[PDB]
Structure 1
Amino acid sequence: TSAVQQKLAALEKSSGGRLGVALIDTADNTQVLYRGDERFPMCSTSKVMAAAAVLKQSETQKQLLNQPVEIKPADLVNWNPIAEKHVNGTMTLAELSAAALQYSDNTAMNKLIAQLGGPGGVTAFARAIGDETFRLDRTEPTLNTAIPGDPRDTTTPRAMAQTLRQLTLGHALGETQRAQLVTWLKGNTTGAASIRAGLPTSWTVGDKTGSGDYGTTNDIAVIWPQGRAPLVLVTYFTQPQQNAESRRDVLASAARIIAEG
């Protein structure tokens, strides 16, 4: 019930939905949590785990990121902004990872899942790095159904914040791979209205957004304030109505509240 809690609780109450927040400050390893142990549909934020797991593979298969992967008409799903540009051609695994992370391409995510042996291979990597909460159960696009109470394709804010810190600031990946993940997250094109919109102008951000049914609107971010040790912030949001519209403003507002405490 620190000052931020009542403020985050008030934001949630004004929003009509369910808000989950987890912050980690690497300067002193303290944490702020709001519904930190409740499950939320991850939606596209799970693409970070899949991309990281492929990077882990490339620590042994050194040229793996350069491997071409055919894009067939049957591979296309519901949102394929980059993969649709390469049907009947190829994209490398690096290009598929970038398309997944920076444009939220769902065909690209499915190629990453396939490279890992299915959703259980993404969950396997989460276990290998100490995340016992993350579970990926479906491919795209069905992982976004975001049905209330459904444990499939969920994690908690606390678990995802620890994971993102290990991948981007810790040593869960090789240094080359960590740098590549950071470059990918910083190049994200879909995050301008989410966590980034609630943070000071001078802070560098890498993030992955998520969106799904029930108005589910998510963002997970690694944040470098200037003259200060980096931060990790997860903001998850979902709504009672299956048809609810996106609420990226809630994530911006949560980030601003966090950034003010």
Structure 2
Amino acid sequence: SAVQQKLAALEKSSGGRLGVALIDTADNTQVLYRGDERFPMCSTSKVMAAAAVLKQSETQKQLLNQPVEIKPADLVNYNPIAEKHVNGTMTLAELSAAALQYSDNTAMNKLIAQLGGPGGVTAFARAIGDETFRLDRTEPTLNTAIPGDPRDTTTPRAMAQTLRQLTLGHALGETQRAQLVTWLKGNTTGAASIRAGLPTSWTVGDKTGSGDYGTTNDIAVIWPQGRAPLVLVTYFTQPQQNAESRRDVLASAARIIAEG
């Protein structure tokens, strides 16, 4: 198809490996490019950890208000919100927000601990029908993005379907889903990624991710004006261990999709 030819040309010009999945919820059609290849998730995995804690809060009604202590030993390499609360507490809601909207790595590690380790995040994926997602490590080593390594990977097709079920579907309770959507819509890190390739009147909720090998990712739910929502996953990685991030590739892939 025309879109797939343009995405292949974009990939060739970029020198990397691009994976795209679009679900159009108007007719449940899909557009895929390397849709079944594995890519390193990096921080896009934080959506799954936050959704898992949201699922626990359906039975533990007060869980999101539970205070969690932030100690100096908890801080890792990138903790823009947790740093502000060292030797104090943050609730699980505040940690989920920090993880999603600022990509805070300490916040992610607290969410993983709440779920009982990376195996608890993976379990949640399996419970909602995602047999592809795997989380193996904590922050910051889950971002090593080594070519061929299956740890901490998913495919574009699997992540698009799962993001659809979490945000537009009913994998979560109604209050929980609305909370997740509100968090995604308030992301602060996405201005130069998928959002940059889309009409400025469209509402987007997204989670970015970045890591070694120039890995540059973004997953988004998109609400066009007077038109059914879309789910769009864009993953990108490069052959050089020290390659620079390429958010422009994600923007360009979104623009090519939006032309459809």
TM range, normalised to the smaller chain?
A: over 0.9
Distance 2:59 2:71 in 1: 28
Shift of 1:156: 0.1
Distance 1:135 1:48 in 2: 13
Shift of 1:194: 0.2
Shift of 1:140: 0.2
Deviations, residues 57-101 of structure 1 (Å, cap 9, x unaligned): 000000100000000000000000000000000000000000000
Shift of 1:254: 0.2
After the TM superposition, which segments of 4 or more aligned residues of structure 1 sit over 2 Å from their partners? none
Distance 1:174 1:74 in 2: 34
Shift of 1:259: 0.4
Give the gaps of 5 or more residues in structure 1.
Answer: none
Distance 1:179 1:58 in 2: 13
Q: Secondary structure at 2:146's aligned position in 1?
A: coil
Shift of 1:196: 0.3
Distance 1:107 1:222 in 2: 25
Shift of 1:248: 0.3
Distance 1:12 1:64 in 2: 44
Give the gaps of 5 or more residues in structure 2.
Answer: none
Q: Does 1:139 align with 2:138?
A: yes
Aligned residues: 260
Shift of 1:144: 0.1
TM-score by length of 2: 1.00
Shift of 1:187: 0.3
Distance 2:174 2:43 in 1: 24
Percentage identity across aligned positions?
100
Deviations, residues 20-46 of structure 1 (Å, cap 9, x unaligned): 000000000000000000000000000
Shift of 1:235: 0.1
Shift of 1:113: 0.2
Distance 1:81 1:147 in 2: 26
Which residue is 1:54 aligned to? Answer: 53
Q: Secondary structure at 1:111's aligned position in 2?
A: helix
Q: Secondary structure at 2:208's aligned position in 1?
A: strand
Deviations, residues 88-130 of structure 1 (Å, cap 9, x unaligned): 0000000000000000000000000000000000000000000
Shift of 1:160: 0.1
Quote the RMSD (CA, aligned, Å): 0.3
Shift of 1:133: 0.1
Distance 2:182 2:12 in 1: 36
Deviations, residues 187-206 of structure 1 (Å, cap 9, x unaligned): 00000000000001110000
Which residue is 1:245 aligned to? Answer: 244
Shift of 1:179: 0.3
TM-score by length of 1: 0.99
Q: Secondary structure at 1:102's aligned position in 2?
A: helix
Which residue is 2:89 aligned to? Answer: 90
Which residue is 1:254 aligned to? Answer: 253
